[PDB]
Amino acid sequence: LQEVSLRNCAVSCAGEKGGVAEACPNIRKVDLSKNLLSSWDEVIHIADQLRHLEVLNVSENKLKFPSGSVLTGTLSVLKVLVLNQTGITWAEVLRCVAGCPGLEELYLESNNIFISERPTDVLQTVKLLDLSSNQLIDENQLYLIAHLPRLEQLILSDTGISSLHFPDAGIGCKTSMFPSLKYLVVNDNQISQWSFFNELEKLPSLRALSCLRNPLTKEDKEAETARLLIIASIGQLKTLNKCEILPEERRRAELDYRKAFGNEWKQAGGHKDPEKNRLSEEFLTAHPRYQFLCLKYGALKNQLLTLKIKYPHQLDQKVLEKQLPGSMTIQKVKGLLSRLLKVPVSDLLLSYESPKKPGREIELENDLKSLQFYSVENGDCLLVRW
Amino acid sequence: CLLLCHRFPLIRKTTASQVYETLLTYSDVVGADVLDEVVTVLSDTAWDAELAVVREQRNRLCDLLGVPRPQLV
Asked: What is its induction (chain B)?
């Protein structure tokens, strides 16, 4: 048994000292979530009894951590540790990760974590730091955890923040914070400014991205436009909204961005001459990557004819008016009249008279042509002779 | 109706114009109280435009002439 799942199985005690190591010594995954565990010493004993514990899941358990400063067990084999809906703090997290030198994934969702100090010797190998559903974590708390060299994965969502700038990074410069953050999950956020993407573009190694459910990336008619703007803002981006960004789509987004912002670039003092290019500070701060792009890509009803119908031979009929298309051929009108008057189409004579030229009658003989070729305009009349 | 929404917009426009001409020619195809709405819809529709905009209008004509709506995967 390598993968053990004991979710909602009522587990409160640990058992015998050595029974778990003797019954199933090849245990690699443990899913002891939502159990009857009311203390942390039991989980510590269970983890100590295992030697190949690679994944340990003990979320949704009401546990009380000891206040002592003694390292209660060391798990060098533990890598993935999920701790969600457990009510943990920053100090407890730092005390727990102090004994896990091989910890590579850590989940901390719905815990109300208040970051205060900077982890120095601890958290030196943790890559994923899922800090979701934490309204206490703001922008000032993400600066301290940004000095982790091994931090590569950051799932920070439903946090409430709407700005993440970088004071150590200027216009078009890379920031020292987050040296390996390549994908930060963004959802349930109230981002209503375009400076967030411009600040995230300054990351040293940013690739994937996911900005779902936001006031700027709503599921409306402006979703594609906002997606293209986000793609054109971050040049090193390779994935947006869990979707691969093709080179053609990126080129199209950048071209649309340039075409839409050329007016604002020229109104701020831009020019094709590098010696005369004097942009303002506001345009440089709002669009740091605009200079790179400028250097790369350089600097049936209307066709209707309301005409009347007359019959010189039969004056008892009324002068009716029809609306026929302009591209209608003569043969179609002849066939219409044939059935209309129950008259053979073989002996049908067609003519038109325009009010601009009174007294002149131009005949219509060729059936292969159209009404547009005979200069038939709107307001003319059709004469039917048979 | 299947040709009314073709991939080529010129074919769509030609089919619409030909259908309008045939409806103006023959009068025993559609009733008197139905032909008026058909002519009003066919005249006030730009068949050389976004297919999503045009399609919606063609489904309308089918429902106005007693024709099942043809659909694709």
From this structure: Down-regulated by shear stress.
